[PDB]
Amino acid sequence: TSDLIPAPPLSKVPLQQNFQDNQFQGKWYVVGLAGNAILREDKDPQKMYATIYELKEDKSYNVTSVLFRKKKCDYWIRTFVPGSQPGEFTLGNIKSYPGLTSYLVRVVSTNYNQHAMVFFKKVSQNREYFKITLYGRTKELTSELKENFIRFSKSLGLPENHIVFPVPIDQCID
Ligand SMILES: [Ac+3]
Predict the structure, then answer these.
(1) What distance in Å separates the CA atoms of residue 172 and residue 166, rounded to the nearest whole number?
(2) Full set of structural domains in the chain with CATH
(3) Lowest CB count within 10 Å: 13, 57, 91, 101, which one?
(4) Rg of the chain over CA atoms, in angstroms?
C-alpha cells in the first residue's frame, strides 16, 4: 500500500530554452529537493549531496552522485541520454534497474554558472514518482531562488512538508 501525490502533466513543467549541454557540465550541489516521495524529517535532516554531469563524446551525460552515509562516501552512476528536445533526457540501460519502466529528466531553468531546477519523473514497480532538484554551483543560494523553488514545487501539487533544503556538509561533496 502506497498513496502518492500524482505526477503533474509535462505541460506544467517548463523546459530551459536553448539548453547548452556543455555549460551544464561539472559539479552541482543539491540545495533543494521536492517530490511525491520526499518528506521533511526534523529527526534526521537530509544532508546535502552533489551530482556531477560529464558530457561523453556521444553527448549523453555520465551523472555521478556522491552522498555521505554511514561515515562513507557512496557514489551512484546514471547515464542521461538526450531525449525529445535539448534539455530533456531518458535513462541509459534501464534493463539494469529492477522494476524501472520509465525515467524522464527535464531541465526546467538554469543560468549554468549559479543555479538550476531539474524535474525528474519515473515509474518504478508501477508507481509514478516525481521530484524537482534545486541545484547550486555553491552550497548556498539566495532566499529569492529558494522561494522560487518552493513556488514551482507547490504549482506541481507538492505541499511544504514534501520540500526540503538539505543541510550543507563538507564530507564527500567538496
Ligand atoms: Ac533517482
Answers:
(1) 15
(2) 1-174 (2.40.128.20)
(3) 57
(4) 15
